[PDB]
Design a protein around this ligand. Structure first.
Ligand code: CLA
Ligand code: CLA
Ligand code: CLA
Ligand code: CLA
Ligand code: CLA
Ligand code: CLA
Ligand code: CLA
Ligand SMILES: CCCCCCCCCCCCCCCC(=O)OC[C@H](COP(=O)(O)OC[C@@H](O)CO)OC(=O)CCCCCCCCCCCCCCC
Ligand SMILES: CC1=C(/C=C/C(C)=C/C=C/C(C)=C/C=C/C=C(C)/C=C/C=C(C)/C=C/C2=C(C)CCCC2(C)C)C(C)(C)CCC1
Ligand SMILES: CC1=C(/C=C/C(C)=C\C=C\C(C)=C\C=C\C=C(C)/C=C/C=C(C)/C=C/C2=C(C)CCCC2(C)C)C(C)(C)CCC1
Ligand SMILES: CC1=C(C/C=C(\C)CCC[C@H](C)CCC[C@H](C)CCCC(C)C)C(=O)c2ccccc2C1=O
Ligand code: SF4
Ligand code: SF4
Lengths: 73, 80, 72, 164, 741, 73, 41, 144
């Protein structure tokens, strides 16, 4: 059981860093939005265009990582 | 008010003006494309920021670009 | 509620409430100084995350303290 | 006894749990006629149960204090103490089939890129090409290391990035 | 003839050539994939026939043959339930002792240890205890042999092939024209007359001639292989005259109007059969006879080809008054030229029918040995309330699809619909008020009881031993319906159910039905129901009325029914479509109906169900609804925590699959919160970062990976949310009530 | 003991997700590529796709096999 | 029936044939070789 | 020929029984927007505030609270009905402001003489980094 739950903890740590590192490195841009640094850190979206851009900002990727953080802890 | 800038990648196909629900955008003479025309944003006081203009821009890495700025009673789209 | 429901349902609801306040007799006298709008998108994220985290912490704190100090 | 453990053929909690399961099956069996269709299936469940306990005690699995078999997931404690069939043999019995599927799908993609329009043969899979790559993918680690020695396994920085 | 058959010979050539081309129906999807959004748009736009073509004739042909496809699937389903009741069941055993043998009709294969699910249901049989109530149907029909089940299963396969052939015929070979479908008067005359009227006349015939004598011989106590076969009940009038001594007079009292002589087998008893706990089948026989006469009268109402009858356009255009402008003018032309406007009304009233069925089948249990099978009662109530709530939300959806697509302001000037659009702000504002009022004065009563019980102040609570909120109106209705056989229904031998008052029917030592007292907690939960139903109406009706425009977005109808938003502008316009309103109404239908089925499952286990000893009947949960449902902690402790104590320790038993699904639906539900809380611009960039890894190892797919759409991710989130919540409650209910019921 | 452990573990989880939050604010507001020509902070953004794809692999492996062994048991 | 065989070669039809094949292979294996926790000989 | 037309309230409104979606106190305190169009025949149009009105032959005058409501009405008059509407801006002190076709020509067609505001003579990938625009008084985008 401690094997299984230490790998659950490793799942939580690696997924929380996946969300946070992906928010920190795509903070300046991505192929969906190459000028994300022009809008700043916190902004809603870039509209419905290009498929839809809900939760595209780096703030919104901290945001989804707080859920996986509370999950891990 | 929101910040609506356009860029010289404009092909002058005037789709942002037809897509604009607020008449912020209009087509101006220019000599950097085959259509001999480029957009403009003279009326960014009336912009809400709904970004229908840059759902309609065909150029890769959009030529029109709305930057969400301060919100007045016209930028919030209020009848009240 | 701030996580699943997003803003634009609520702005359409608040516009009907603005109508109801500005057409009610004797409540026309009372008028706001800030125009009522719904919470913005980033704000909806922060409020839903804040309630999520506060309910998470308060649930597990009540469970932890009671579950340990009840039998001990 | 590798890490505080015990063989399952030695421990008594394992035999007590076998007798517990057979006791539940026996008191379940006591309701029916001895030749009826539920009683045949209950005795077949008992036979599969006893065969399962005999073949878990035969393979030398390690029980704990709980009476349950354990898996030593380290080579050098599985190879030295005869537990390689726990993890160390299926960790290659899996990876052969994993790299098999990952090679068959890779070659099906690469053999359909150079066509008129590839996407129609990804919703409508070319079955003779698929079964040809299914059969001839049997020696995938061989072809994978021969493809890695070229550099034709990877692609260079012709790949698509954003703004480094 | 204005009303006539009018078809088109060979409109669509039967070929597999368009099965080879996915997306042939759509103008945009026919070019093939370039993007994984294509294959989701293929399945999403598959049955949206109104967006494929604009020809209403072609749309009507597609929706008329798709209904034959659904009917063929229902006949496959029913025929499979009859076949699984024939070949894999204890129904033969269950007919000899339908009080100690559990109904089972599903047997598993013994492979991976799943043969533990073949539990000891009794009768020398192992299988999964079913809860769908088919065995009580089959006793009420007079089956008595698995040969009859096997032959009606073969008849169901034949009828499913008839339905599939019928859809093939009426789409490909001889498909009806548009003005065939627009004869709604003939459709109503034939459906009230032939479907509803003749169908209940035929079921009246089966009940008079087959099920009344067979169930009378069962209730007297006769082995089912000793009972005469029902064809020996048709041919021999002497056996029917032995069972009901007015069959000796033949059909002469029917044509001499001496119908009182038929009172041996068409009764108005009411109450329950005390032998079996169900309704009297003579009473249901006279029921379907009267229903048959009523609907055959009703199906001669509308004018088709002779001058007699009504025409519905003249009915609608006459009912107009001073308050409502032009009245019902134009409603005939929008309920004849729009399928979504029909599907709104039909899903509304059909989902209301499911809930009325659910409340009318616990209180008046219509089947023998149904009421004491507590698991069947609970699952039937829960099933039909969920089907009803889904159909009501679909009503709210397709009304708004009518508002977006098929609404025309030219055809609707100053009628009812235009005047409702012109005071939608008043409607939604007053409904906003009444939802806030019901929320405070319903849920704040529970918060008040929580606070007073936590502050050591149990006298200040809302309970029966405290501040009382008695449901005076429902108690008065219970008194009048219990005293209805006295003077307002003088030919009723008993009340129409036992819930109104009186004694209890006890069958097999278990309570079939007993009177239901309505106290303070019943008041509080009925106002919780009124609150949640009004909020679901608020969301769905706000989506219908503001489907085309609002003060926020004035051109919402140009954006469509199903669009995500209109960007971050004007404050943010997330979830402004009508699709997003029925998305949010699905959660409140879940919220409402979960409390409805919880209130059922705890009111029945507290105050109705349980064993009897004729020594002060002891219920299942001991009688703690009125005594402990004052508080949210009472619903937590005494209902969720206390009654989950059989789904959580179900492992190592036949109920252990309910132990698994209870975990698994806790998974799927929470899995939905990945889709509801997050957004697309995260996942598209994550897909970019792994498309790079598939580019580096030359395994990028040609169909390019995209994140799900905005209104697709909302659909995935609400679908997984509903599945994981409803299946959690499914496993909880069934593992509770199979064990302790 | 339970309160102190759970207290400082949630404090540590919030502070560790805010470390990455302000690391994301750094790349938008403070980062200059012409000032950071070729250092570790630019090579990090250079192979950001490799970082996010390997965190995605580790998280996907850990979740697949941890949930698989729990559902198996 | 060339169009019927192209329909049989579409993605969900190949998916539901291949998953029944790989399901009913492992199912026949676990019938003829019950309970394989460990690689025996 | 065309030079900035004026407005009178004497022109009639289309026949409409009145909705609850009309003007609010912003119309009386801040501003409200009026739209004019000349119709050729009497026909039914959908209000942007909900409901159907029938326009009458000749000049019409209809008042709204948003520019999006007026431009949505022009969008459905120019597309469904091929009319040529124009809307203005009215403040409560009587000051009226011509808003739509400033130059007479609709904005999706070049009038050869309007001035190109808010144009960047550079590509959007050539924006500066936000470190270069830091401490510019207010918070500021690199697109400036
Ligand atoms: C996560 C890495 C890891 C860790 C912590 C250990 C830990 C250990 N190994 Mg080990 N081992 C590993 C990976 C690891 N192994 C791998 C990948 C191999 C090669 C397949 C081996 C091969 C190996 C051998 C051959 C031996 C150990 C031994 C040992 C023990 C000293 C200790 C329990 C030794 C042992 O038995 O303990 C004394 C020993 O003889 N290991
Ligand atoms: C929609 C209705 C429906 C449903 C849900 C089921 C469901 C089931 N049937 Mg059933 N069945 C149905 C209609 C239905 N049937 C009809 C109409 C017939 C008559 C043709 C049958 C005839 C039938 C037989 C003869 C058997 C089942 C069996 C089964 C079970 C396993 C099926 C299986 O492994 O697939 C097999 C996989 C592929 C075909 C691929 C499963 C519970 C089996 C069972 O219960 O064993 C105890 C079994 O032997 N069914
Ligand atoms: C008395 C004549 C009669 C009867 C019984 C029905 C019965 C039905 N109609 Mg219907 N219809 C009729 C006349 C009739 N119609 C006329 C005159 C018109 C034209 C104005 C229509 C136009 C119409 C449409 C447009 C649709 C229906 C649909 C339906 C079905 C509703 C679903 C249901 O309750 O399933 C109950 C199931 C049963 C009763 C099972 C028994 C099946 C019987 C044998 C077939 C129905 C009787 C059939 C009309 C007799 C014709 C036999 C054929 C060889 C000519 C039902 C089968 C809907 C549907 O589902 O279509 C498939 C639908 O979309 N009807
Ligand atoms: C569609 C429904 C239906 C059908 C097919 C039948 C069919 C039949 N009934 Mg029946 N019946 C029905 C409804 C039906 N009934 C209803 C609703 C009532 C109540 C009014 C009766 C009351 C009734 C009586 C009292 C008798 C029949 C009898 C008969 C049989 C001969 C009829 C005759 O003499 O001419 C025949 C099997 C006669 C018979 O011999 O039945 C065994 C007979 O005595 N029926
Ligand atoms: C437990 C969670 C929860 C709660 C309390 C609410 C609360 C509410 N929702 Mg909501 N919602 C939720 C979850 C919840 N939602 C979720 C998960 C979704 C996702 C789909 C939605 C989606 C949703 C929609 C789409 C709509 C609502 C609506 C409403 C309102 C209707 C109830 C009302 O007005 O009664 C009054 C308020 C309550 C019962 C809340 C509790 C108040 C208690 C009883 C007493 C007050 C506290 C007391 C004064 C002490 C104050 C202390 C002081 C220090 C401040 C209300 C604001 C509707 C609305 O706003 O229109 C009416 C509406 O349209 N919600
Ligand atoms: C040494 C600690 C430290 C410091 C100095 C800062 C400083 C800063 N952060 Mg940072 N941050 C930190 C830790 C820190 N942070 C941690 C640990 C996290 C993870 C939680 C974050 C997450 C974070 C984000 C995501 C953002 C910042 C931002 C900011 C900047 C603006 C501050 C702001 O918005 O204040 C105002 C802050 C508030 C009004 C807080 C809101 C209230 C919160 C939700 C608490 C509510 C709980 C509630 C009261 C509980 C009551 C229960 C009730 C029942 C009684 C500023 C440079 C922002 C920025 O730079 O903008 C671009 C930004 O977007 N930070
Ligand atoms: C119980 C809820 C739940 C679950 C299961 C997950 C699962 C996951 N999240 Mg998370 N997430 C959640 C809630 C949840 N999340 C919430 C509430 C949020 C806030 C919005 C997030 C936000 C979030 C972000 C922001 C990220 C994730 C990521 C991930 C993935 C991590 C990799 C992994 O573990 O793969 C293991 C996979 C699983 C555990 C689920 C698979 C289930 C089985 C194995 C699939 C097959 C079952 C069966 C055959 C299917 C039959 C279906 C049908 C035919 C009947 C994984 C898919 C990250 C990611 O994508 O990593 C690549 C990521 O970036 N999540
Ligand atoms: C319910 C009591 C509502 C009164 C009632 O039943 O209807 C009374 C009245 C019916 O109007 P008429 O008598 O003109 O009815 C003509 C109808 O046949 C429809 O045209 O309806 C209205 O005035 C609108 C009702 C909404 C009133 C909102 C109040 C809530
Ligand atoms: C074995 C052992 C040992 C050792 C230990 C060690 C060596 C440890 C280490 C550890 C470590 C080594 C740790 C680390 C950690 C790290 C971390 C935790 C990090 C984090 C990061 C972050 C958070 C980031 C942030 C950011 C970003 C996002 C980007 C850029 C910007 C910045 C930087 C801000 C000894 C012998 C002594 C003892 C015994 C045991
Ligand atoms: C084998 C496999 C695996 C795994 C998997 C898993 C892990 C799963 C899980 C899953 C989970 C973790 C959970 C789940 C759950 C499920 C569910 C839960 C389902 C459901 C379904 C249904 C179908 C339902 C139905 C119903 C009911 C019952 C109620 C109401 C009514 C209805 C009908 C709706 C892997 C990957 C390794 C590999 C591949 C394959
Ligand atoms: C996880 C997630 C995704 C990512 C989900 C991806 C796009 C789909 C998940 C994988 C699907 C199931 C495709 C995988 C199966 C393929 C058909 C390949 C099958 C191969 C064999 C099994 C045959 C979103 O796109 C999204 C969008 C909006 C809000 C929330 C979310 C969201 O939470
Ligand atoms: S939908 Fe996407 S874009 Fe439109 S508002 Fe919500 S988040 Fe911003
Ligand atoms: S942006 Fe796109 S649409 Fe607007 S002008 Fe330039 S090209 Fe034409």
């Amino acid at each position: 059981g401690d094997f299984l739950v230490h790998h659950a903890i490793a799942l939580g740590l690696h997924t929380t860093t996946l969300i946070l590192v992906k928010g920190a490195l795509d903070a300046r841009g991505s192929k969906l939005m190459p000028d994300k640094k022009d809008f700043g850190y916190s902004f809603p979206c870039d509209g419905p265009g290009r498929g839809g851009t809900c939760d595209i900002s780096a703030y919104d990727a901290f945001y989804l990582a707080v859920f996986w953080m509370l999950n891990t802890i | 008010a929101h910040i609506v800038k356009i860029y010289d990648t404009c092909i002058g196909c005037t789709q942002c003006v037809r897509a604009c629900p607020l008449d912020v955008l209009e087509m101006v003479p220019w000599d950097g494309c085959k259509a001999s025309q480029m957009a403009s944003a003279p009326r960014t006081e009336d912009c809400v920021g709904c970004k229908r203009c840059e759902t309609a821009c065909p150029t890769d890495f959009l030529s029109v670009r709305v930057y969400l700025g301060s919100e007045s009673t016209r930028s919030m789209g209020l009848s009240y | 509620m701030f996580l699943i429901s997003w803003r634009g349902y609520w702005q359409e609801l608040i516009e009907t409430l603005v109508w109801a306040h500005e057409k009610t007799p004797l409540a026309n006298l009372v008028y706001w100084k800030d125009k009522p709008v719904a919470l913005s998108i980033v704000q909806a994220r922060l409020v839903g995350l804040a309630h999520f985290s506060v309910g998470y912490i308060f649930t597990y704190a009540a469970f932890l303290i009671a579950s340990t100090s009840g039998r001990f | 006894d590798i890490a505080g453990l015990t063989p399952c053929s030695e421990s008594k909690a394992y035999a007590k749990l076998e007798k517990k399961e057979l006791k539940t099956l026996e008191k379940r069996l006591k309701q029916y006629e001895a030749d009826s269709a539920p009683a045949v299936a209950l005795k077949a469940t008992m036979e599969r149960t006893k065969a399962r306990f005999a073949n878990y005690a035969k393979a030398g699995l390690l029980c704990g204090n709980d009476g349950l078999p354990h898996l030593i997931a380290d080579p050098g404690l599985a190879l030295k103490y005869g537990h390689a069939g726990e993890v160390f043999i299926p960790t290659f019995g899996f990876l052969y089939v994993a790299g098999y599927i990952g090679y068959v799908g890779r070659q099906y993609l690469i053999a359909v890129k150079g066509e008129a329009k590839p996407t129609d043969k990804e919703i409508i899979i070319d079955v003779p090409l698929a079964t040809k790559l299914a059969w001839q993918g049997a020696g995938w680690p061989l072809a994978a290391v021969q493809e890695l020695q070229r550099g034709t396994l990877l692609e260079k920085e012709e790949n698509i990035t954003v703004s480094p | 003839k204005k009303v006539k058959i009018a078809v088109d010979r060979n409109p669509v050539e039967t070929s597999f050539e368009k099965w080879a081309k996915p997306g042939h129906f759509s103008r945009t999807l026919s070019k093939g994939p370039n993007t994984t959004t294509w294959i989701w748009n293929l399945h999403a736009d598959a049955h949206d026939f109104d967006s494929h073509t604009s020809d209403l004739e072609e749309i009507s042909r597609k929706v008329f043959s798709a209904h034959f496809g659904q009917l063929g699937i229902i006949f496959i389903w029913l025929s499979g339930m009859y076949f699984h009741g024939a070949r894999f069941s204890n129904y033969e055993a269950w007919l000899s002792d339908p009080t100690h043998i559990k109904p089972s009709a599903q047997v598993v294969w013994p492979i991976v240890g799943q043969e533990i699910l073949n539990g000891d249901v009794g009768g020398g049989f192992q299988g999964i205890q079913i809860t769908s109530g088919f065995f009580q149907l089959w006793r009420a029909s007079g089956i008595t042999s698995e040969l009859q089940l096997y032959t009606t299963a073969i008849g169901g396969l034949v009828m499913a092939a008839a339905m599939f052939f019928a859809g093939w015929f009426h789409y490909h070979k001889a498909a009806p024209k548009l003005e065939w479908f627009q004869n709604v008067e003939s459709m109503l005359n034939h459906h009230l007359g032939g479907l509803l009227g003749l169908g209940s006349l035929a079921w009246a015939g089966h009940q008079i001639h087959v099920s009344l004598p067979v169930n009378k011989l069962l209730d007297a106590g006769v082995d089912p292989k000793e009972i005469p076969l029902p064809h020996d009940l048709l041919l021999n009038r002497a056996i029917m005259a032995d069972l009901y001594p007015s069959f000796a007079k033949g059909i002469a009292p029917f044509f001499t109007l001496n119908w009182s002589e038929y009172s041996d087998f068409l009764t108005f008893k009411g109450g329950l059969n005390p032998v079996t706990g169900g309704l009297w089948l003579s009473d249901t026989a006279h029921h379907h006879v009267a229903i048959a006469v009523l609907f055959l009268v009703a199906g001669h109402m509308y004018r088709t080809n002779w001058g007699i009858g009504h025409s519905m356009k003249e009915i609608l255009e006459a009912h107009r008054g001073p308050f409502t402008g032009e009245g019902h003018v134009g409603l005939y032309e929008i309920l004849t030229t729009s399928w979504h406007a029909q599907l709104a009304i039909n899903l509304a009233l059909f989902g209301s029918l499911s809930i009325i069925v659910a409340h009318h089948m616990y209180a008046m249990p219509p089947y023998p040995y149904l009421a004491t099978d507590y698991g069947t009662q609970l699952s039937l109530f829960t099933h039909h309330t969920w089907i009803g709530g889904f159909c009501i939300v679909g009503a709210g959806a397709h009304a708004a699809i009518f508002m977006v697509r098929d609404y025309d302001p030219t055809n609707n000037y100053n009628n009812l619909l235009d005047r409702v659009i012109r005071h939608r702000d008043a409607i939604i504002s007053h409904l906003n008020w009444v939802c806030i009022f019901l929320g405070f004065h319903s849920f704040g009563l529970y918060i008040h009881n929580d606070t007073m019980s936590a502050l050591g102040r149990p006298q200040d609570m809302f309970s029966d031993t405290a501040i009382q909120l008695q449901p005076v109106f429902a108690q008065w209705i219970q008194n009048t319906h219990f005293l209805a056989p006295q003077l307002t229904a003088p030919n009723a031998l008993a009340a129409t159910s036992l819930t109104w008052g009186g004694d209890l029917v006890a069958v097999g030592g278990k309570v079939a039905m007993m009177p239901i007292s309505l106290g303070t907690s019943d008041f509080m939960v009925h106002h919780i129901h009124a609150f949640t139903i009004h909020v679901t109406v608020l969301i769905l009706l706000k989506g219908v009325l503001f489907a085309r425009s609002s003060r926020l977005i004035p051109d919402k109808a140009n954006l469509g029914f199903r669009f995500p938003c209109d960007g971050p502008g004007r404050g943010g316009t997330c979830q402004v479509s009508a699709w997003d309103h029925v998305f949010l109404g699905l959660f409140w239908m879940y919220n409402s109906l979960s409390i409805v089925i919880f209130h059922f499952s705890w009111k029945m286990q507290s105050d109705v169900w349980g064993t009897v000893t004729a020594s002060g009947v002891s219920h299942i949960t001991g009688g703690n609804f009125a005594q402990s449902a004052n508080t949210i902690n009472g619903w937590l402790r005494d209902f969720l925590w206390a009654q989950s104590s059989q789904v959580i320790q179900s492992y190592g038993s036949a109920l252990s699959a309910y132990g698994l699904i209870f975990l698994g639906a806790h998974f799927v539900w929470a899995f939905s919160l990945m889709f509801l809380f997050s957004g697309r611009g995260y996942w598209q960039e994550l897909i970019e970062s792994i498309v790079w890894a598939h580019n580096k190892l030359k395994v990028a797919p040609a169909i390019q990976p995209r994140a799900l759409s905005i209104t697709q991710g909302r659909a995935v989130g609400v679908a997984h949310y509903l599945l994981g919540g409803i299946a959690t409650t499914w496993s909880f209910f069934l593992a509770r009530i199979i064990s302790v019921g | 003991q339970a309160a102190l452990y759970t207290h400082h573990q949630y404090i540590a989880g919030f502070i560790m997700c805010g470390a990455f939050a302000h690391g994301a604010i750094f790349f938008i507001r403070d980062y200059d590529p012409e000032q950071n020509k070729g250092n570790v902070l630019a090579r990090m953004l250079d192979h950001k796709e490799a970082l996010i794809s390997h965190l995605s692999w580790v998280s996907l492996f850990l979740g697949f096999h941890t949930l698989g062994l729990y559902v198996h048991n | 029936m060339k169009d019927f065989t192209t329909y049989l070669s579409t993605a969900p039809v190949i998916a539901t044939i291949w998953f029944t094949f790989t399901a009913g292979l492992l199912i026949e294996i676990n019938r003829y070789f019950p309970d394989p926790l460990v690689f025996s000989f | 020929a065309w030079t900035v037309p004026t407005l009178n309230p004497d022109t009639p409104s289309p026949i409409f029984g009145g909705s609850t979606g009309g003007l609010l106190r912003k119309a009386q305190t801040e501003e409200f927007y009026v739209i004019t169009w000349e119709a050729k025949k009497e026909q039914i149009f959908e209000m942007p505030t909900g409901g159907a009105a029938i326009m009458r032959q000749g000049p019409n005058l209809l008042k709204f609270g948003k520019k999006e409501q007026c431009l949505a009405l022009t969008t459905q008059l120019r597309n469904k009905f091929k009319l040529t509407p124009c809307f203005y801006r009215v403040f409560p002190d009587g000051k009226v402001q011509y808003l739509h076709p400033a130059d007479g020509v609709y904005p999706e067609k070049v009038n050869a003489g309007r001035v190109g505001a808010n144009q960047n003579m550079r590509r959007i990938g050539q924006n500066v980094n936000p470190i270069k625009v830091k401490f510019s008084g207010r918070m500021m985008s690199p697109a400036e």
